[PDB]
Amino acid sequence: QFAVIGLGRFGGSICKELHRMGHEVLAVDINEEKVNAYASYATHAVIANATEENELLSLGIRNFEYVIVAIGANIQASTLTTLLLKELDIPNIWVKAQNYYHHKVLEKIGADRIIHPQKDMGVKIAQSLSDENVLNYIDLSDEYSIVELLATRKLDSKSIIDLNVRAKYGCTILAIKHHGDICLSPAPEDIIREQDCLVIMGHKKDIKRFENEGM
Amino acid sequence: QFAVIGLGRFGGSICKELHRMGHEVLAVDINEEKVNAYASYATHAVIANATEENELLSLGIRNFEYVIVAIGANIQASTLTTLLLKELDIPNIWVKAQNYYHHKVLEKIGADRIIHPQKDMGVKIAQSLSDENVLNYIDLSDEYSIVELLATRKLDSKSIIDLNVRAKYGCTILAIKHHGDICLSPAPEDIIREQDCLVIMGHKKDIKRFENEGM
Amino acid sequence: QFAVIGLGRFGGSICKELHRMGHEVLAVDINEEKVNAYASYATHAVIANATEENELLSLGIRNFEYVIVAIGANIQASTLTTLLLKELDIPNIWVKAQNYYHHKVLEKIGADRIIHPQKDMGVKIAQSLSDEN
Amino acid sequence: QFAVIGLGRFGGSICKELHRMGHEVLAVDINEEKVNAYASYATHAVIANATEENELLSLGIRNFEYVIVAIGANIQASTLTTLLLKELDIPNIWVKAQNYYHHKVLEKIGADRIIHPQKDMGVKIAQSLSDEN
Amino acid sequence: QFAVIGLGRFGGSICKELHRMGHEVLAVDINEEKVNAYASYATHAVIANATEENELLSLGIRNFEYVIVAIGANIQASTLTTLLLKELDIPNIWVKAQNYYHHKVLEKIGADRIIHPQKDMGVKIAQSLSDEN
Amino acid sequence: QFAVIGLGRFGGSICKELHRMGHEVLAVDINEEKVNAYASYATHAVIANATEENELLSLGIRNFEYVIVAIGANIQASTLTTLLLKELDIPNIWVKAQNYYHHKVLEKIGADRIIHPQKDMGVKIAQSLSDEN
Amino acid sequence: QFAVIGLGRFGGSICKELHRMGHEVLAVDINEEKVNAYASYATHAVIANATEENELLSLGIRNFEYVIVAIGANIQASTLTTLLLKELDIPNIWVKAQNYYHHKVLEKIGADRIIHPQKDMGVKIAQSLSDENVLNYIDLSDEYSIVELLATRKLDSKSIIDLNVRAKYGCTILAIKHHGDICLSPAPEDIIREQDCLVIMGHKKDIKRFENEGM
Amino acid sequence: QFAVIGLGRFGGSICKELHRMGHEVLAVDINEEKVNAYASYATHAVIANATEENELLSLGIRNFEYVIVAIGANIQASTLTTLLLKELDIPNIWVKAQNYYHHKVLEKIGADRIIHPQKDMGVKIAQSLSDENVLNYIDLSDEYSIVELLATRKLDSKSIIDLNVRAKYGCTILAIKHHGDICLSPAPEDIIREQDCLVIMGHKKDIKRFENEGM
Ligand SMILES: Nc1ncnc2c1ncn2[C@@H]1O[C@H](COP(=O)(O)OP(=O)(O)O)[C@@H](O)[C@H]1O
Ligand SMILES: Nc1ncnc2c1ncn2[C@@H]1O[C@H](COP(=O)(O)OP(=O)(O)O)[C@@H](O)[C@H]1O
Ligand SMILES: Nc1ncnc2c1ncn2[C@@H]1O[C@H](COP(=O)(O)OP(=O)(O)O)[C@@H](O)[C@H]1O
Ligand SMILES: Nc1ncnc2c1ncn2[C@@H]1O[C@H](COP(=O)(O)OP(=O)(O)O)[C@@H](O)[C@H]1O
Ligand SMILES: Nc1ncnc2c1ncn2[C@@H]1O[C@H](COP(=O)(O)OP(=O)(O)O)[C@@H](O)[C@H]1O
Ligand SMILES: Nc1ncnc2c1ncn2[C@@H]1O[C@H](COP(=O)(O)OP(=O)(O)O)[C@@H](O)[C@H]1O
Ligand SMILES: Nc1ncnc2c1ncn2[C@@H]1O[C@H](COP(=O)(O)OP(=O)(O)O)[C@@H](O)[C@H]1O
Ligand SMILES: Nc1ncnc2c1ncn2[C@@H]1O[C@H](COP(=O)(O)OP(=O)(O)O)[C@@H](O)[C@H]1O
């Protein structure tokens, strides 16, 4: 179902994670050491030059719905490989881009999705920096969002009804995670202890307000 | 308030994003071209060798609450920088790790947070791969999660009350985004049209079940 | 009618010859000396970075039916330029290829004609060697 | 009858084309991969450093009426090879020139024909652009 | 009982002297010549990259109570080796420091003793100059 | 009474320690920063190129009974300096050796004592490892 | 009148010596330090790339009757320089050759004189080796030579008439240098003291004979 | 009788020339190709590292009265070799110097003669440049010299008595070389034809005078 062509810092993580999730993954790499190291973290692991068409054919690359092109430094190899894959009519080709130019040429040679890892981690890290309590989040729209917050010493031993967010800030609490244990859509009697995960939902500015005065 | 020491693919994104959010950021780089290119995307931009203590002092680095060490290839430079910063009693030092070894030595020299960008993008990309319908998601815990899904033709013109997720699958719908318009905590009469954003919340396997039989 | 983007050993020859035949040619080059040397061998000669879209727009590159991409060594610059030209709906884009890979990426990004100079002169020279008469 | 010393974009084409025409061609190259790839496109293919006289002798280079010096980037190697060949009394020595200077030194050391591939393809491409019909 | 990882001016001396005293010493080195030269001055001598964990395991490095990290110039290799050894729960890890920074990072990753050779020989030489008698 | 020509890891230690013991020491260094840093750790500190005879004369190097040549990496500078000092009839010349070869040439050019810092600290460290008590 | 293009071990010596003799010399070098060091040993000294024609023109290189190309390692630079100089119609171009190939190409591009320094010093050193008594010499032809000899204890207090070289060995004595004082075409009564300079002239083998039995 | 340790541009010439003169020479070289190439130009040729004492012993280096150290670039190897040779009490050790420092250390480690090839060829070339007619010469003293001159079109078909040098310039002609044929101490009736070798003897300034007005 999944084939990962470059087993580096980026692609290797994709391989290991997909394997950990329970999907079947074929790992490819030109470097034998890399192939050996990922033998345990993949259904199958093969030594192959992804820029060589007959080798791609030998891999049975056609058996796959998703092929990930994760060769970092060598732009030539990456775009050539992506090209060969597009020739073989692979349904989904995901390639890691190094820069603007690489993104452009991948764009035109029919890459289905282009990933800028360090860029995205850039914005994500910026998000966590801007607010140290936000552990994670998802934006529903330009104005509305669901936010994951780390409870500070302002929130310990407080009940949901005490923190009347539904009226005071127009936001609603969705979940509380205490010592790994999880409470979904909790009732107003429930207690939030410090260092716990708190999942709020509402307007961005309203959530910021609640963070400011509340915690 | 924020200082970014390495203006590369990773650090540059952090800088640009922090600047876009409205925070004041001091960008550092040994490469003059990089400093010039990030002049517009930062409050201040300086040419400096982050491995030279007197230069760090010249930057007024102690005036900052958060310093980001984002020098990629040069592990020596990274750990040296982190060390010097730790000597200067910087409250929060975030460093990009290249490998396991780098993570360990940064860990021991008192790095406050160590980031593996390509790894994390690895797992999230794996997440988007496992379901093309999940546009985004957030893990509340090992078993429970909030998921954003792309509506298929199986869900078109279906009501929330028609798709009884709260009893049949034990999960709860949180939001519906239809042509950009947004419905928060929608009522059972509401309609879901295909290709719209659907926000479900619950157990991972249960949501997977709902994906399987429902859509 | 004709624009030549790279004034090197290859492109410069195209420019000079087209000019000698009596056609009007706009010569482009990032190197000022090259532009100066071909001032006499072209209707107009301009300093410009062919990988910069706004510069291409400033050249009035769309007013041309034929644009020749003759940047040799820099594969990246060549393909990026070809790309920008393809975006600007240029009717005929002819590019000099460095190798097989360059030929492939140029092929896919919609190059109208891809030339392998050394190859073609190769077969031509072989022809001349086969019968000197 | 024919020997091609540099199996690159230029020389490789000469080799392949001469072989395709039905002439017997000896392909030389310092790079083993190139030699391997042109085994099928030549009567014989040999790994050799064309700047080493004893290797040239080992090739039986004197048995040839036409020897082609097609080493691109390395001007030094090119002129050294041409020189050694001129010493071995080769009847016809054709060399690919990189620039004006290379053309001059090849000219003086007795090169029988000096080819500027990109230039000639330049004028021919200009010809084709001038009248597409 | 003793393992010396870097057989240079510093570590080689440790090895030779420990061997001369009658203790059993395992000498390690990435350079084959060094390993060969110290075969006679050690119980066992092995070619190995001290920055590679599986090689460390292959050496049976855990069987040793004292491991000496004596890699000079390469600070990275030194700290990486020290780190790997600290992971393998080596009881006593003594490392040669190049500078203040190296001393600090070795200090934090749990080096049992950090030696500054030139400094100590400095103070001792000063002692000898102060009273030659 | 004492002159230290190289203020590095080795020589700087000698200087600082001799100064701490109460002897008068003249510190030399080609690097101004080094001279500045050791201003407090020496009776006098001077910027000078030890391979330049007139500079040595300007230092009043002959007024000293002991001159320490502690220039590490630069073997040439070290031996040249030692040589100039031997010409100037310096009573005691002590030089830091880099390797066997350096030891040999220093040996022949009349060095009074040749020190191998890393070697000696090597045996010393081996001693400390043999009996931790 | 004289221009030296390469100020290295070879060319620098030519420059310095020509300057010491009293001729006016323009020294050229691409290396600024070299140009600075030869400022005192030349009429003029200039930083210039000898492979750049416009720079050569800027030097006023055509105003010179003799131009010396003494660039060692870089054969390409040497031949290119020689070529450019030949284009500028320089009357006399002397170039240092690195090897046989270099000698040949310089020969063909119209070098007026090609020098192999280490070769020539090779043969002369061989000459001084064959007889430690020959301090210097000059070959008139393949068979005949003029030789300068160091007097041994076999020749001490001997007269020219005592050592009848003109008949017994067919050679003729030309000069005697005794404690620096010099005697040209000395009379038969003159005495030769040991360790003095003796200038004989004749056939090589005959002089060797005289060395053998005489001294 | 002679051993040459470095078979390069310099040492190889010494070897070949000594061999051509008829002396027996042992050539040493660490490079096998060099040893093979000089097999024909030496009595014996051996592959050896001159910095290795036991190899020197294996060569039978002790059998030689003269050992030439002609290793160019590697100063360390040169001085180390010279040192080893001095330890083995070789009577005559001649070494090629690269620079001032090398000359100094060779001087102190007991080198019997130190040669600066390119320097000496420098002064020699300067001599031939200063006067194009002087082919060679030997200085008897600061003021007096014997000079070899190339006859110009001023001297063709002239008799020695016509060019009364013995009175007019105080100099005396010693030899005339015509088409390889040689005339020693020629009588006044003899003719000098152009392009012939002419050997004059006398005062330097006087010889210059004769060159000026005569030829
Ligand atoms: N032609 C190729 N075929 C297959 N695998 C390749 C090829 N070129 C590179 N790779 C693999 O891709 C990986 C690149 O990893 P890396 O350079 O760390 O990129 P990233 O930083 O994106 O992880 C390497 O592990 C290498 O083995
Ligand atoms: N010692 C240093 N001090 C300051 N900046 C540095 C230093 N070393 C490297 N840099 C900067 O850090 C940047 C590294 O970026 P890059 O190598 O792309 O890392 P990444 O791939 O993680 O973005 C370079 O642009 C360089 O200018
Ligand atoms: N990005 C660019 N935009 C515009 N001109 C460029 C760009 N990159 C290179 N050039 C020009 O193209 C020319 C390339 O010529 P060259 O490298 O000699 O190729 P060739 O050998 O095929 O002629 C150079 O003279 C350079 O000035
Ligand atoms: N010294 C040499 N002897 C023999 N062959 C050589 C030598 N140097 C280079 N070559 C060969 O000549 C070829 C030159 O090809 P290339 O650099 O592509 O020139 P071009 O661009 O003109 O084709 C290479 O394949 C190389 O193997
Ligand atoms: N990664 C490594 N693994 C094992 N041994 C190493 C490694 N790197 C260097 N060494 C060895 O360590 C020794 C270091 O010696 P040297 O550089 O002279 O240090 P010092 O000057 O302290 O003696 C070398 O002999 C080298 O072979
Ligand atoms: N020619 C010279 N004259 C005077 N001082 C010199 C000369 N060459 C080097 N030095 C000084 O000697 C010091 C050498 O120290 P270093 O290279 O660290 O050797 P070590 O590692 O043995 O201390 C340098 O600080 C330099 O300033
Ligand atoms: N292209 C050039 N133009 C001018 N000077 C040059 C050029 N290339 C080299 N040189 C000079 O010529 C000198 C070469 O000297 P060197 O390598 O010692 O030759 P040699 O050993 O024959 O003296 C260098 O000092 C360098 O500065
Ligand atoms: N350790 C050594 N033992 C023997 N021969 C050596 C050694 N090192 C170098 N050589 C020889 O000395 C020669 C040096 O020649 P080269 O570098 O041209 O110097 P030069 O310019 O004085 O001729 C080389 O041919 C090499 O084979």
DSSP string, chain A: -EEE---STTHHHHHHHHHHHT--EEEEESSHHHHHHTSTTSSEEEE--TT-HHHHHHHTGGG-SEEEE---S-HHHHHHHHHHHHHTT-SEEEEE--SHHHHHHHHHTT-SEEE-HHHHHHHHHHHHHH-SSEEEEEESSSSEEEEEEE--TTTTTEETTTS-HHHHTS-EEEEEEETTEEEES--TT-EE-TT-EEEEEEEHHHHHHHHHHH-
Q: Strand, coil or helix: what is D122?
A: helix
User: What distance in Å separates the CA atoms of residue G166 and residue A104, rounded to the nearest whole number?
Assistant: 94
For the CA atoms of H35, H41, H44, H45, what is the dihedral angle to 10 degrees?
-10
Decide if A104 touches C, using CB distance below 8 A.
yes
The CA distance from H130 to the nearest CA of chain G, in Å, is 7
Nearest Cβ partner for B104 among E75, E83, E101: E83
Q: Strand, coil or helix: what is E4?
A: strand
Q: Which of G124, G146, G200, G128 is nearest to H182 (CA)?
A: G146
- F128 is written with which tokens? 């400390």
Enumerate residues 6+ apart whose C-beta is below 8 A from G157: G191, G192, G193
Q: Which of G10, G201, G164 is nearest to H140 (CA)?
A: G201
User: What distance in Å separates the CA atoms of residue B184 and residue C50, rounded to the nearest whole number?
Assistant: 49
User: What distance in Å separates the CA atoms of residue D112 and residue D107, rounded to the nearest whole number?
Assistant: 8
Measured between beta carbons, the chain G residues lying within 8 angstroms of D105 are: 79, 83, 105, 108-109
User: What distance in Å separates the CA atoms of residue E108 and residue E103, rounded to the nearest whole number?
Assistant: 9
Q: How far is the CA of F9 from the centre of ligand 6 (A)?
A: 9
In the 8-state DSSP scheme, what is residue E30? S
Decide if C30 touches A, using CB distance below 8 A.
no
CB contact (8 A) between residue E83 and residue B76: no
Q: Is the CB of F77 under 6 A from ligand 6?
A: yes
Handedness of CA E92, E93, E95, E100 (dihedral sign): negative
Amino acid at E121: M
Angle F91-F97-F99 from CA coordinates, rounded to 5°: 150
Decide if C6 touches D, using CB distance below 8 A.
no
User: What distance in Å separates the CA atoms of residue B95 and residue B93, rounded to the nearest whole number?
Assistant: 7
Core vs surface per residue D13-43: b (16+ CB within 10 A) or e: bbbbbbbeeeeebbbbbbeeebbeebeebbe
Decide if F124 touches E, using CB distance below 8 A.
yes
- The answer to whether the CB of E115 falls within 8 A of the CB of F121 is yes
CB contact (8 A) between residue B121 and residue A23: no
Enumerate residues 6+ apart whose C-beta is below 8 A from F40: none
Q: How far is the CA of G39 from the centre of ligand 6 (A)?
A: 29
> Count of CB atoms within 10 A of residue D119's CB?
19
User: What distance in Å separates the CA atoms of residue F118 and residue F114, rounded to the nearest whole number?
Assistant: 13
Amino acid at A103: H
- The answer to whether the CB of A67 falls within 8 A of the CB of A25 is no
A residues 178-197 near B, CB within 8 Å?
180, 182, 184-185, 197
User: What distance in Å separates the CA atoms of residue F81 and residue F69, rounded to the nearest whole number?
Assistant: 7
User: What distance in Å separates the CA atoms of residue A6 and residue A34, rounded to the nearest whole number?
Assistant: 9
- Give the position, in ligand 6's atom list, of the atom nearest the Cα of F12: 23
Chain A residue at shortest CA distance from C80: A101
User: What is the DSSP code string of H69-129?
Assistant: E---S-HHHHHHHHHHHHHTT-SEEEEE--SHHHHHHHHHTT-SEEE-HHHHHHHHHHHHH
For chain D, report the end-to-end CA distance as a whole number of angstroms.
38
Backbone angles phi, psi at B3, to 5 degrees: -125, 130
Chain E residue at shortest CA distance from F125: E14
> Count of CB atoms within 10 A of residue H214's CB?
17
Q: E strand or H helix at D86, and its extent?
A: helix D75-87
Helix-, strand-, coil-residue percentages of chain C, each rounded to 5: 45, 20, 35
The crossing angle, in degrees rounded to 10, of helices G117-130 and H11-21 is 40
User: What distance in Å separates the CA atoms of residue H117 and residue A5, rounded to the nearest whole number?
Assistant: 60
Q: Strand, coil or helix: what is C122?
A: helix
Q: Strand, coil or helix: what is D4?
A: strand
User: What distance in Å separates the CA atoms of residue C52 and residue C6, rounded to the nearest whole number?
Assistant: 14
Decide if B100 touches E, using CB distance below 8 A.
no
Place of tokens 């990072």: E105
- The answer to whether the CB of F47 falls within 8 A of the CB of F73 is no
- The answer to whether the CB of B185 falls within 8 A of the CB of B125 is no
CA distance to B100, B126, C52, E119, F117, per residue, from E106 (Å) = 17, 37, 49, 17, 21
Instruction: Determine how β-strand B158-159 pairs with β-strand B144-150.
Output: unpaired
Measured between beta carbons, the chain D residues lying within 8 angstroms of C127 are: 17
Measured between beta carbons, the chain E residues lying within 8 angstroms of F94 are: 125, 129
Place of tokens 């552990």: A135
Q: Which of B155, B168, B131, B135 is nearest to B215 (CA)?
A: B155
> Count of CB atoms within 10 A of residue C108's CB?
18
Backbone angles phi, psi at H159, to 5 degrees: -90, 160
Measured between beta carbons, the chain D residues lying within 8 angstroms of C9 are: 99, 116, 118-119, 122
Handedness of CA E111, E115, E116, E118 (dihedral sign): negative
- The answer to whether the CB of F61 falls within 8 A of the CB of F82 is no
Ligand 4 binding residues, C-beta < 6 A: C 118; D 5-11, 28-31, 34, 48-51, 70-74, 77, 96
Angle H1-H2-H8 from CA coordinates, rounded to 5°: 165
- Asked whether B and A share 3 or more beta-carbon pairs under 8 angstroms, the answer is yes
User: What distance in Å separates the CA atoms of residue B120 and residue B10, rounded to the nearest whole number?
Assistant: 13
Query: Residue A181, by phi and psi: left (phi above 0), alpha (psi -120 to 50) or beta?
Result: beta
Write a three-state SS string for chain F. Answer: CEEECCCCCCHHHHHHHHHHHCCCEEEEECCHHHHHHCCCCCCEEEECCCCCHHHHHHHCHHHCCEEEECCCCCHHHHHHHHHHHHHCCCCEEEEECCCHHHHHHHHHCCCCEEECHHHHHHHHHHHHHHCCC
Angle H177-H182-H186 from CA coordinates, rounded to 5°: 90
Decide if C78 touches A, using CB distance below 8 A.
no
Q: Is the CB of E78 under 6 A from ligand 5?
A: no
Measured between beta carbons, the chain F residues lying within 8 angstroms of H109 are: 105, 108-109
Q: Which of G161, G118, G154 is nearest to G133 (CA)?
A: G154
CA distance to E21, E63, E74, E94, F123, per residue, from E44 (Å) = 15, 14, 24, 20, 19
Cross-strand bridge partners of residue H198: H149, H176
Backbone angles phi, psi at C70, to 5 degrees: -120, 60
Distance from CA of residue H186 to its chain's centroid? 27
Cross-strand bridge partners of residue G96: G115
Enumerate residues 6+ apart whose C-beta is below 8 A from D114: D94, D95, D96, D97, D103, D106, D107
Decide if C46 touches A, using CB distance below 8 A.
no
Decide if G205 touches H, using CB distance below 8 A.
no
User: What distance in Å separates the CA atoms of residue B73 and residue B71, rounded to the nearest whole number?
Assistant: 7
Q: Is the CB of H102 under 6 A from ligand 8?
A: no
- B68 is written with which tokens? 């980001």
Residue E108: CA count within 13 A, CB half-sphere: 21
- A129 is written with which tokens? 């920096």
Handedness of CA G163, G169, G170, G174 (dihedral sign): negative
In the 8-state DSSP scheme, what is residue E132? -
Write a three-state SS string for chain B. Answer: CEEECCCCCCHHHHHHHHHHHCCCEEEEECCHHHHHHCCCCCCEEEECCCCCHHHHHHHCHHHCCEEEECCCCCHHHHHHHHHHHHHCCCCEEEEECCCHHHHHHHHHCCCCEEECHHHHHHHHHHHHHHCCCEEEEEECCCCEEEEEEECCCCCCCEECCCCCHHHHCCCEEEEEEECCEEEECCCCCCEECCCCEEEEEEEHHHHHHHHHHHC
Decide if H9 touches G, using CB distance below 8 A.
yes
Amino acid at F112: D
Enumerate residues 6+ apart whose C-beta is below 8 A from A158: A191, A192
CA distance to E10, E36, E94, E102, per residue, from E5 (Å) = 11, 14, 10, 17
Burial tier of A5 (Cβ tally within 10 Å: 0-12, 13-18, 19+): buried
Decide if G126 touches H, using CB distance below 8 A.
yes
The CA distance from B15 to the nearest CA of chain E, in Å, is 28
CB contact (8 A) between residue D130 and residue C23: yes
Amino acid at B124: K
User: What distance in Å separates the CA atoms of residue D83 and residue G79, rounded to the nearest whole number?
Assistant: 14
- D90 is written with which tokens? 């080769």
User: What distance in Å separates the CA atoms of residue E18 and residue G114, rounded to the nearest whole number?
Assistant: 62
CB contact (8 A) between residue F75 and residue H80: no
Q: Which of B142, B144, B140, B131 is nearest to B198 (CA)?
A: B131
Chain G residue at shortest CA distance from D80: G101
For the CA atoms of G4, G7, G11, G17, what is the dihedral angle to 10 degrees?
80
User: What distance in Å separates the CA atoms of residue A132 and residue G148, rounded to the nearest whole number?
Assistant: 94
Query: Residue H180, by phi and psi: left (phi above 0), alpha (psi -120 to 50) or beta?
Result: left
- The answer to whether the CB of B159 falls within 8 A of the CB of B192 is yes
Backbone angles phi, psi at H130, to 5 degrees: -65, -35
User: What distance in Å separates the CA atoms of residue C7 and residue E70, rounded to the nearest whole number?
Assistant: 57
User: What distance in Å separates the CA atoms of residue A80 and residue A87, rounded to the nearest whole number?
Assistant: 11
For chain A, report the end-to-end CA distance as a whole number of angstroms.
46
User: What is the DSSP code string of D100-121?
Assistant: HHHHHHHHHTT-SEEE-HHHHH
Residue D9: CA count within 13 A, CB half-sphere: 18
Backbone angles phi, psi at A60, to 5 degrees: 70, 40
- H188 is written with which tokens? 């006044």
- C30 is written with which tokens? 């990032």
- Give the position, in ligand 3's atom list, of the atom nearest the Cα of C77: 1
Handedness of CA H125, H130, H134, H138 (dihedral sign): negative
The crossing angle, in degrees rounded to 10, of helices C100-108 and A75-87 is 60
Decide if B21 touches A, using CB distance below 8 A.
yes
- The answer to whether the CB of C20 falls within 8 A of the CB of D129 is no
Write a three-state SS string for B173-202. Answer: EEEEEECCEEEECCCCCCEECCCCEEEEEE
Q: How far is the CA of D4 from the centre of ligand 4 (A)?
A: 10
- Give the position, in ligand 6's atom list, of the atom nearest the Cα of F31: 27
Q: How far is the CA of F87 from the centre of ligand 6 (A)?
A: 21
- The answer to whether the CB of B46 falls within 8 A of the CB of B26 is yes
User: What distance in Å separates the CA atoms of residue C34 and residue A51, rounded to the nearest whole number?
Assistant: 37
Domain annotation for chain B: domains and CATH numbers: 1-116 (3.40.50.720), 131-215 (3.30.70.1450)
> Count of CB atoms within 10 A of residue B131's CB?
15
Enumerate residues 6+ apart whose C-beta is below 8 A from G181: none
User: What distance in Å separates the CA atoms of residue H15 and residue H1, rounded to the nearest whole number?
Assistant: 12
Decide if A41 touches B, using CB distance below 8 A.
no
Q: How far is the CA of F27 from the centre of ligand 5 (A)?
A: 32
Q: Whose CA is nearest to atom 20 of ligand 8?
A: H72
Q: How far is the CA of C111 from the centre of ligand 3 (A)?
A: 18
CA distance to B161, G58, G63, H44, per residue, from G47 (Å) = 87, 11, 18, 48
Distance from CA of residue G149 to its chain's centroid? 20
Q: Which of D28, D49, D50 is nearest to D39 (CA)?
A: D28
- Name subunits touching G (3+ CB pairs < 8 A): D, H
- H155 is written with which tokens? 């001297």
> Count of CB atoms within 10 A of residue C74's CB?
15
CB contact (8 A) between residue F108 and residue H83: yes
- The answer to whether the CB of G138 falls within 8 A of the CB of H146 is yes
Sheet holding F66-69, edge to edge: F44-47, F25-29, F2-4, F66-69, F92-96, F113-115
Amino acid at A17: E
Nearest Cβ partner for B138 among A10, A115, A148: A148
Q: Which of F91, E77, D38 is nearest to E85 (CA)?
A: E77
Q: Strand, coil or helix: what is E7?
A: coil
User: What is the DSSP code string of chain G?
Assistant: -EEE---STTHHHHHHHHHHHT--EEEEES-HHHHHHTSTTSSEEEE--TT-HHHHHHHTGGG-SEEEE---S-HHHHHHHHHHHHHTT-SEEEEE-SSHHHHHHHHHTT-SEEE-HHHHHHHHHHHHHH-SSEEEEEESSSSEEEEEEE--TTSTTEETTTS-HHHHTS-EEEEEEETTEEEES--TT-EE-TT-EEEEEEEHHHHHHIIIII-
Q: How far is the CA of F77 from the centre of ligand 5 (A)?
A: 25
Amino acid at B52: E
In the 8-state DSSP scheme, what is residue E128? H
